[PDB]
């Protein structure tokens, strides 16, 4: 069939290193990309294609309700159990992750179309900013 | 505002390594994760949240009409300029990327529930198999 539409998830990838070597792709980029799964989203209408190739390392999903304490197992991260509670401190979204670690949690808040996110653990703080897509 | 719904693309990321160092994230995972951008898709209905975070590294999109040669600037790959032409051969989608590299192109066809991709660059051939999600 000529119908290539849909979302396609990779299950095999042989000689991806040789094809990148022949493409003159630098050594450091080759080693990051050689161990990432691929996702192809093909939008085809007759003879017109819109091909989208996303290469991902790891996905992490968490679901919660504000005010309800839940157990968050950080699988594929540090693989720990933490008692997490997400509350509103204004329009900022605060979350404490009570567990084996100290001062562990995050803070989310929106302004305009920028997502401010701070991640804390022990005495380390990571500051990320996301512009909306 | 209290509405964080939507898809968010990472703009900045300071001290992401130190935060993962705090979490005792394994070294093999740390060196890869710090070099990759992130995407966050937040599904929010009131206080009910559904948070998804992905570790990416380089997307590639391409648009073409079958039979219409076009200018493929291979951005995110090797950023060479090749004039690609996509044609049908039975139900196999064949593309030839004429440029500095010989025998450069790919073949993309469907058999059942699986997408088959065969990227070639001179001496090397990479072959991938996807499954429909």
| Number of distinct helices of chain A | 2
**Shape category of chain A:** elongated
Distance between the termini of chain A: 34 Å
Count of structural domains of chain A: 1
Helix amount of chain A, in percent?
Answer: 10-25%
What portion of the residues of chain A fall into strands of 2 or more residues?
over 45%
CATH uppermost class of chain A? Mainly Beta
Chain pair with largest interface: A-B, 78 and 77 residues
CATH H-level superfamily title of chain A: Calycin beta-barrel core domain
Lateral strand order in the biggest sheet of chain A: 5-6-7-8-9-10
* SSE string of chain A, helices as H and strands as E: EHHEEEEEEEEE
Radius of gyration of chain A: 20 Å
Number of strands of chain A: 10
Largest sheet of chain A: 6 strands, antiparallel
| Helix-and-strand structural type of chain A | mainly beta
CATH topology of chain A: Lipocalin
Oligomer classification: homodimer
PDB class: lipid binding protein
Keywords: iLBP, Protein Switch, lipid binding protein
Assembly: dimeric
Entry title: Crystal structure of the holo retinal-bound domain-swapped dimer Q108K:T51D:A28H mutant of human Cellular Retinol Binding Protein II
């Amino acid at each position: 069939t000529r119908d290539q539409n849909g979302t396609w998830e990779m299950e095999s990838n042989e000689n991806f290193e040789g094809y990148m070597k022949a493409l003159d792709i630098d050594f450091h980029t080759r080693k990051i990309a050689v161990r990432l799964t691929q996702t192809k989203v093909i939008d085809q209408d007759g003879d017109n294609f819109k091909d989208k190739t996303t290469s991902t390392f790891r996905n992490y999903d968490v679901d919660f309700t504000v005010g309800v304490e839940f157990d968050e197992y950080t699988k594929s991260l540090d693989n720990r159990h933490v008692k997490a509670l997400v509350t509103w401190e204004g329009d900022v979204l605060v979350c404490v992750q009570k567990g084996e670690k100290e001062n562990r949690g995050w803070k989310k808040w929106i302004e305009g179309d920028k997502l401010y996110l701070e991640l804390t653990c022990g005495d380390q703080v990571c500051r990320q900013v996301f512009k909306k897509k």
